[PDB]
Structure formats: structure tokens, C-alpha cells
Amino acid sequence: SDWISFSHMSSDTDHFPIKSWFRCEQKAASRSYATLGDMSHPQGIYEVRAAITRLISLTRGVKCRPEQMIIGAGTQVLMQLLTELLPKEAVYAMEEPGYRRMYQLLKNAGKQVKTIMLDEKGMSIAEITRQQPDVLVTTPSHQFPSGTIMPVSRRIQLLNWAAEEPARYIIEDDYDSEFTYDVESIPALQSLDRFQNVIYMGTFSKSLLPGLRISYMVLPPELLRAYKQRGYDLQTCSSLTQLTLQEFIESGEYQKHIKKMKQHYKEKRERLITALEAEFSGEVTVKGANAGLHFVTEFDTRRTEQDILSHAAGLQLEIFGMSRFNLKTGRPTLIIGFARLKEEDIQEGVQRLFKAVYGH
Amino acid sequence: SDWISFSHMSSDTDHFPIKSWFRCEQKAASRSYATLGDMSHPQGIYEVRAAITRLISLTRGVKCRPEQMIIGAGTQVLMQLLTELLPKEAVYAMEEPGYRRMYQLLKNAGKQVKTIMLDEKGMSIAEITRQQPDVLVTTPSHQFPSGTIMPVSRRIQLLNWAAEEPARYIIEDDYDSEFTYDVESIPALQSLDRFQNVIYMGTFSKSLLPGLRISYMVLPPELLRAYKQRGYDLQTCSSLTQLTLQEFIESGEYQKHIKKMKQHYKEKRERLITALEAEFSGEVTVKGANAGLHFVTEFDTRRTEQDILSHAAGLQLEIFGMSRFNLKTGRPTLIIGFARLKEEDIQEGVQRLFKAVYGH
Ligand SMILES: Cc1ncc(COP(=O)(O)O)c(CN[C@H](CF)CCC(=O)O)c1O
Ligand SMILES: Cc1ncc(COP(=O)(O)O)c(CN[C@H](CF)CCC(=O)O)c1O
């Protein structure tokens, strides 16, 4: 099987410093072996939380203390916990299109979920004003899946909405925030907030490996107060993985890895986009390519979205359609992930994509 | 700080084959490295599930197929999932005393939880008959915390109750089931069932390390059918830890480890009990010492339970009281864990316990 992946759900393994990660694991183990016989602190190991706290403060401008952070064996399990801290009758609002898994979670939890359309600045403040939700779920760095980078002006507008009335919350899902392309980084919503109505959520799945299972979220003082009154929660993220992450960060291996990958991802994205317009002779529209590890491609073709997806499968091309992210009409659109995609598979994979779309 | 631990929440690190575990990790990694770039199958990696399936079939007699198993980053997260598969208005029944964390979870989930007292055969079938619950939560191998081993006759009685009426479930929490002392092993409730009304739950926290975070549960066909209709769940247990566990088991390292520890735990328990009656001159009543990694000690003393716990702290002795496990009166009773307890700390720790109980 000679498969080529344009999947957004896969990550890079070719350039991941797996030997350094293991060497960090050995060092952390031989240093904190005796602690492995006990269960971790429910919020996660303090030193690990402190290591992440410093990191996100530098890279995203996030203001927090380690006592506010909770780890974190996946965004969903943390989101599950978060819904139980927020008001039970809270009305949730998600981006349309958006993360369907998180949508289905909220629906299955008996919560009312409203869908918010997007403009060129991302999540529409006009629609939020109209539908009047309680909790916002947004992806500022790189809108999942449209890829729109929410500008500061829109970020300020959401912050104002949350601040002008009591019991309003913003869940900043800062997924896929490590990378931008020929545009500058923008501070997180949580950092621009003059108050404390933002829950910041992050993950290491795209910067490290998705199989590692480490996420985190930062609670506002009152929500943190509600969490501590539980007293029955147990840490879900592995202790070995926590201590390995701490060493990986503090040894400087993480920053060294990120520095290497921004250049790698920049070059690969450039080649892929160049190859796309070359093969399609400019008959492909690329959207949301200024950040993240995926972008969107629309096609002027007589074929439907599943006809394309079907042919791609027969051509051994792993790809997903944009209708996957509909929560609640025009040219067919696909999502193109280039994290796992090997550089040598670019020209071949783009040729296979052409056949899946046009036929020949 | 020269602390001695009688804690039931700690595990053995002195005799854990940590170097073998890492060597298993290296072998599994170099063999399945490419899979680390993708998220695991939501139920867990199939080969890992199959490895656990064969294991529990041999040791506990559990009848199941890998398709029925779900991993599994902790019993609580699996129990959380289980409450969402079972009927929403299901009335739960737990052992009194029992696992307070699991009790608080169910209460926080808006579920009605009834408490069932114990007799010499464990969870009272007479009280279950009287209170008429929907779902039973029990710990047959070693009752948490009383330590009573549920005999087959009582196991059969619970199975009959669940089978004589529709929509009745038994959650077999087979925690602390690896070890018995001078008594024979008893097949799991799930294995003795002539039908399929039992959910079998297990963990590797006591056989391996609690920081590893690997648990599992086996669903009945209909409950499995309800799980698959979700389609939004993500695996919470680390992929590296899964693949390491598989290698650890299949290489024969696990069986070799268990064989070594049963002899270790047997000798240590014997010495501890011998030391207890020697120091206390026979004025200590030991209960529930035929299995598990802890037993119960009652004391004829004028001191209350927290006076004892307080003095133990000042004497640098980590210990917990039995009132910790009350869900909803006589001689003070403490729980004595001997998993982490070093052999050289037995005589000293038992002397410290005497001072905490009697004063001198
Ligand atoms: C909106 C969003 N926030 C966070 C994550 C990270 O979750 P975690 O690693 O468990 O912390 C994802 C990633 N979701 C998966 C990407 F591979 C699945 C995509 C699909 O269902 O199309 C995501 O979309
Ligand atoms: C009844 C019961 N079933 C399972 C587990 C194992 O859970 P997990 O490792 O996450 O799979 C425990 C262990 N509970 C902890 C033991 F250290 C805490 C004890 C306390 O709260 O007293 C337990 O009591």
C-alpha cells in the first residue's frame, strides 16, 4: 500500500526528535522515580504545570499561575470537566463550521448549542449579539476548519461582549497556534482581556505527537474555586509523560524543536501551494493558509464532494471534505493537512488529487 | 524527612522492573513508530486490547472479545463514560463502606445512589432486594475497603438478581484482584454469569504503577452497541503506554513480574502481621487480610480516630482512617497498605503506630 496523506488528523513523525524525547524521559525518570509509586496531583504535577505556564506566557502572552492550570489527557476530557464547572443551564455557542466532536459532546451532555457563522474576521460578533449565548467556543489562531485568523479588533469585540454582562464566558481553543506564515503572531484572547472571563485551552498534539495525550486549560479564579470544591477528581495524563514534557521543555529541546519545524513547515507549505497551482493550472482556490498545519481548497468542478472523496480513496489518497465540519451548497471544498505529508509525496499526491477532482 | 508509609494509595517502586519496562518501550516504539503520528483507535489499539483480553481470560476467567474492551486512562473516566451509556434514570447501588470518589462522581452526575451494607459474604443481597436499585457496583476480589472476599454463593445470588428482571446491571470493579494469601483465587462475576448483565472493570495501577494510567472495561453487547453510536469519543490512554504494555505482556515480562511479587507480597504481609501482634501484644484485630494489598486494623483504645491520625502525622507515619470510606461508632479502625512499605521499615513503622494509638 503506497498511501499519500493530506489528512489534518495526522502529525509529523519524520522530524520529531524521538531519541531526544526518550533521553529526556530517562533523565526525568532517574530523577523522580520514587514519585511514580504515587498518583499525580489531580491538576497535574506542579513542576510540569509551572513549565507549561512559563512557556505559554512567552509564546502566547497568556497570563496565569500554575495553580490555575489543569492537565489534561485530551481537550475533550478537559472540555467535559469544564461543562460541569460552568452553569448547568448555560447556552453554548460554537463556530459554524467547527469542531463536530466538541459539538456532539455538548449535545450529548444535554446542553443547548447555538451555531455562529463566520465573516472575514472569524466568529461573527453580530450573530453572537443576536442569538445571545452564555458561553463562546472559538479558535482565534487558526479557525477550525476555515483557517481564518481572528484579528485583534474582533478579539476585542468578543472580550467586550463577555465583560458587559455577568455570567458570560469565552473558551479560547488555541488549537494549531504554534505556526504562522508571512504574518505576525497575535496575542491570545486571554492576554488581551482586561478582566477574567476567558478559559484558555491548549494542546501539544501538533507540536509533539497526538499519541502522547497531553492537553491543558487555564481556569478563571471563580471557576478554579468551583473545581477545588470537588475533591474527587484524578489526574488523567500519564505521570511519565508529564515529567518527560517538563524535561523536554526545560532542557531547551522544545524551543529547539519548534524553531526547526517552523522553517520545515514554511518550506513544505510553500512547495505544496506551488505544486497545487501548477498542476491545476491556477484552477484551485486556497484559503486559510496563513497559519496552522492545514488550509482549504475549493474546486470549480462538475463533481460532487463525495465523488471526489471516493476517487481519492481508490487513488490511495487520504483526504477529508469540508462537509465534515458542518454543525447544523456551492463549489466542493476539501481540507488539506500537510503535517504528516512527506516532501517527496507532494508532486505525486497533488497529481492524484487532480484525478480525483477532474477525472483525468 | 524519614517518613514511613502504611498508605493504601501508594504502590511498590523498589521491585518494579522499570528497566525492563523501558526496554519494552524501545522495542514497541521502533516497531510501531509510524503509528505515533496518528490518534489511537477510540477504544484503544486493537493489539493492546487483544493482549489484555487474553490476559484477563487466563487470570480471572473473563469471557470477552477485544471489540468489547475499552481503554482506559483511569477507572473514573471509564465509569464516567459508563454512566452515560446506562439508562439516565438508573438508580445506582454502592457498597457501604466503599469508594467515596466513585460515590461523589455519581452524586455529582445527578444520579440517585443507594448504599448497601455488608455481611460476612460481602455486599448484602438482602439489602439490594429491599432497596431495589438498577445498577450494582461491587468489589468481589477484595472489598474496598473492608477486604472481604465475596464467595461464589454470594456471587451467584447477585447474578440471579440481575437476571430475573430486565434493565439490571452489575459493575464488577475488580480492583486489587491480582493477589490472594493462603486462599484460592475465585473466578470473576462476569465469568460465572450465564447471561450478559455484567460490566467488568480492571486496572494496572497495583500490578504496575499508578502513574502509568491504564485501565479498561468490558461492555455487554447492547452497551457496546450504544457506545459505537456516539462516534465522537477519543482515546484517553497514551499510545506509547499502550504499546509498551502490549510488549510487556507478550514478551512474558508481566507474568514474570506477577510471579515474583506474589511471593514478595506474601512474605511482607506475613512479617507485618507478625510484627503487629508482637508490638501490640495481640491487642490488634486484623481484618480482610486474605487478598489485596491492604488490610484493616481495629484498636481497643480510649483515643478517637483523628487523635490517632494526628499523632501518626507527628510521628511521620502516613496512614488513613476507615471513616474515609463512609458514604452515608465503635472501636477506631485504620486501613493498612503494605505495597510501598519497605521491609526495613516494618518494625519501626509498627512501633510508631503503637505510639499513635496508645500514646507510649
Ligand atoms: C478544535 C480542536 N481543538 C483541539 C484539538 C486537539 O485535541 P487534543 O489533542 O485531544 O487536545 C483538535 C484536534 N481534533 C482532531 C485533530 F486531529 C480531530 C479533528 C476532526 O475530527 O476532524 C481540534 O480539532
Ligand atoms: C474501588 C477502586 N477501583 C479502582 C481503583 C483504581 O483506579 P484507577 O487506577 O484510576 O484505575 C481504585 C484506587 N483508588 C485509589 C487507590 F489509590 C484511591 C483510594 C482512596 O480514595 O482512598 C479504587 O479504590
Coordinates of C-alpha atoms in Angstrom, one line a residue, chain A residues 24-241:
Chain A
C24 CA 14.5 13.4 28.4
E25 CA 12.4 10.5 29.7
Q26 CA 15.4 8.7 31.1
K27 CA 16.7 11.8 32.8
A28 CA 13.3 12.7 34.3
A29 CA 12.7 9.1 35.4
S30 CA 16.1 8.6 37.2
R31 CA 15.5 11.9 38.9
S32 CA 11.8 11.4 40.0
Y33 CA 11.4 7.7 40.1
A34 CA 10.1 7.4 43.6
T35 CA 7.2 9.7 42.8
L36 CA 5.9 7.1 40.2
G37 CA 4.6 5.0 43.0
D38 CA 2.0 7.6 43.9
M39 CA -0.8 9.2 41.9
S40 CA -0.1 12.6 40.5
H41 CA -1.6 15.8 41.8
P42 CA -5.2 16.0 40.4
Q43 CA -4.3 19.2 38.4
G44 CA -1.1 17.6 37.3
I45 CA 2.4 17.7 38.7
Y46 CA 3.3 21.2 39.8
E47 CA 6.7 21.5 38.2
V48 CA 5.2 20.3 34.9
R49 CA 2.4 22.9 35.2
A50 CA 4.9 25.6 36.0
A51 CA 7.0 24.6 33.0
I52 CA 3.9 24.9 30.7
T53 CA 2.9 28.2 32.4
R54 CA 6.2 29.9 31.6
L55 CA 6.1 28.5 28.0
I56 CA 2.6 29.8 27.1
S57 CA 3.3 33.1 28.8
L58 CA 6.2 33.7 26.4
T59 CA 4.7 32.3 23.2
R60 CA 1.1 33.4 23.5
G61 CA 1.3 36.1 26.2
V62 CA -1.1 34.1 28.5
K63 CA -1.2 35.5 32.0
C64 CA -1.6 32.8 34.6
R65 CA -0.2 31.0 37.7
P66 CA 0.4 27.2 37.8
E67 CA -2.4 26.9 40.4
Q68 CA -4.9 27.9 37.7
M69 CA -3.7 25.2 35.2
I70 CA -5.3 21.7 34.8
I71 CA -3.8 18.8 32.9
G72 CA -5.0 17.3 30.7
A73 CA -5.2 14.0 28.8
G74 CA -7.0 15.5 25.8
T75 CA -9.1 18.6 25.1
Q76 CA -12.3 16.6 25.2
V77 CA -11.9 15.3 28.7
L78 CA -11.0 18.9 29.9
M79 CA -14.0 20.3 28.0
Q80 CA -16.1 17.6 29.7
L81 CA -14.8 18.9 33.0
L82 CA -15.4 22.5 32.0
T83 CA -19.1 22.0 31.2
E84 CA -19.6 20.7 34.7
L85 CA -18.0 23.8 36.2
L86 CA -19.8 26.3 34.1
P87 CA -23.6 26.9 34.8
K88 CA -25.6 23.8 34.1
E89 CA -28.2 25.8 32.0
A90 CA -25.5 27.7 30.1
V91 CA -26.2 28.2 26.4
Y92 CA -23.2 27.4 24.3
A93 CA -22.2 28.9 21.0
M94 CA -19.8 27.3 18.5
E95 CA -18.3 28.4 15.2
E96 CA -20.1 27.3 12.1
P97 CA -18.3 25.3 10.6
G98 CA -16.3 24.0 13.6
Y99 CA -15.3 21.0 15.7
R100 CA -18.1 18.5 15.3
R101 CA -16.7 16.2 18.1
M102 CA -17.0 19.0 20.6
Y103 CA -20.4 19.9 19.2
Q104 CA -21.6 16.3 19.6
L105 CA -20.2 16.2 23.2
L106 CA -22.1 19.3 24.2
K107 CA -25.3 18.0 22.6
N108 CA -24.9 14.6 24.3
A109 CA -24.4 16.5 27.6
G110 CA -28.0 17.9 27.3
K111 CA -26.7 21.4 26.5
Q112 CA -28.2 23.8 24.1
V113 CA -25.7 24.7 21.4
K114 CA -26.2 27.6 19.0
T115 CA -24.1 27.9 15.8
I116 CA -22.4 31.1 14.8
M117 CA -21.5 31.9 11.2
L118 CA -18.2 33.4 10.2
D119 CA -17.1 36.6 8.3
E120 CA -13.6 37.6 7.2
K121 CA -12.7 38.4 10.8
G122 CA -13.8 35.0 12.1
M123 CA -16.6 34.3 14.6
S124 CA -19.4 36.9 13.9
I125 CA -20.0 39.3 16.9
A126 CA -23.2 40.4 15.1
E127 CA -24.6 36.8 15.3
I128 CA -23.5 36.4 18.9
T129 CA -25.3 39.6 19.8
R130 CA -28.4 38.3 18.0
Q131 CA -28.6 34.8 19.4
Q132 CA -27.4 35.8 22.9
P133 CA -25.5 32.8 24.2
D134 CA -23.8 32.3 27.5
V135 CA -20.5 30.6 26.6
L136 CA -18.5 31.1 23.4
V137 CA -16.2 28.5 21.9
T138 CA -13.7 30.0 19.4
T139 CA -10.4 29.2 17.6
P140 CA -8.6 32.6 17.1
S141 CA -5.1 31.5 15.9
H142 CA -6.4 29.4 13.0
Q143 CA -10.2 28.8 12.7
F144 CA -11.1 25.1 12.6
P145 CA -11.6 24.4 9.8
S146 CA -11.8 27.6 7.7
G147 CA -8.4 28.8 8.8
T148 CA -9.3 32.4 9.3
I149 CA -7.0 34.2 11.7
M150 CA -9.1 36.3 14.1
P151 CA -7.7 39.9 14.1
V152 CA -7.3 41.9 17.3
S153 CA -10.3 44.1 16.5
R154 CA -12.6 41.1 16.5
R155 CA -10.8 39.7 19.6
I156 CA -11.5 43.0 21.4
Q157 CA -15.2 42.8 20.3
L158 CA -15.6 39.3 21.9
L159 CA -13.9 40.5 25.1
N160 CA -16.3 43.5 25.3
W161 CA -19.3 41.2 24.9
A162 CA -18.2 38.9 27.7
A163 CA -17.4 41.8 30.0
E164 CA -20.6 43.9 29.7
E165 CA -22.8 41.3 31.3
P166 CA -22.3 38.9 34.2
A167 CA -22.0 35.1 33.7
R168 CA -20.5 35.3 30.2
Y169 CA -17.6 33.1 29.3
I170 CA -15.1 32.7 26.4
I171 CA -13.5 29.4 25.8
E172 CA -10.3 30.1 23.8
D173 CA -9.5 26.9 22.0
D174 CA -5.9 27.8 20.9
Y175 CA -5.5 24.6 18.8
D176 CA -3.0 24.8 16.0
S177 CA -1.4 28.0 17.3
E178 CA 2.3 27.3 17.0
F179 CA 2.8 28.4 13.4
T180 CA 2.1 31.3 11.1
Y181 CA 3.3 32.1 7.6
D182 CA 4.4 35.6 6.4
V183 CA 2.1 37.1 9.0
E184 CA 2.9 38.1 12.6
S185 CA 1.7 36.2 15.7
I186 CA -1.2 37.6 17.5
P187 CA -1.6 37.6 21.4
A188 CA -4.2 35.2 22.8
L189 CA -7.7 36.4 23.7
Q190 CA -6.9 35.6 27.4
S191 CA -3.9 38.0 27.2
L192 CA -5.9 40.9 25.7
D193 CA -8.6 40.6 28.4
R194 CA -8.7 43.4 30.9
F195 CA -10.9 41.1 33.1
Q196 CA -11.0 37.3 33.7
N197 CA -13.8 35.8 31.5
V198 CA -11.6 33.7 29.3
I199 CA -10.8 30.0 29.7
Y200 CA -7.6 29.3 27.8
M201 CA -7.2 25.7 26.3
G202 CA -4.1 24.3 24.6
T203 CA -2.6 21.1 23.4
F204 CA 0.7 19.5 22.5
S205 CA -0.7 17.2 19.8
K206 CA 0.5 19.2 16.8
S207 CA 3.8 20.4 18.3
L208 CA 4.7 16.9 19.6
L209 CA 2.7 13.8 18.9
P210 CA -1.0 13.2 19.2
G211 CA -0.4 9.8 20.8
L212 CA 1.3 11.4 23.7
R213 CA -2.0 12.7 25.0
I214 CA -1.2 16.0 26.9
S215 CA -3.5 18.9 27.0
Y216 CA -4.2 21.7 29.5
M217 CA -6.5 24.5 30.4
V218 CA -6.3 27.7 32.5
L219 CA -9.3 28.5 34.8
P220 CA -10.5 31.9 35.9
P221 CA -10.3 32.4 39.7
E222 CA -14.0 31.6 40.3
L223 CA -14.1 28.6 38.1
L224 CA -10.9 27.3 39.8
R225 CA -12.7 27.8 43.1
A226 CA -15.6 25.6 41.8
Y227 CA -13.1 22.9 40.7
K228 CA -11.3 22.6 44.1
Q229 CA -14.7 22.1 45.9
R230 CA -15.0 18.7 44.1
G231 CA -12.1 16.9 45.7
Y232 CA -12.7 13.6 43.9
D233 CA -11.0 14.2 40.5
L234 CA -8.0 12.2 39.5
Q235 CA -5.2 13.2 37.0
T236 CA -5.8 11.5 33.6
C237 CA -2.5 12.4 31.9
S238 CA 0.4 9.9 32.5
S239 CA 2.9 10.9 35.1
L240 CA 5.9 9.7 33.0
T241 CA 4.7 11.8 30.0

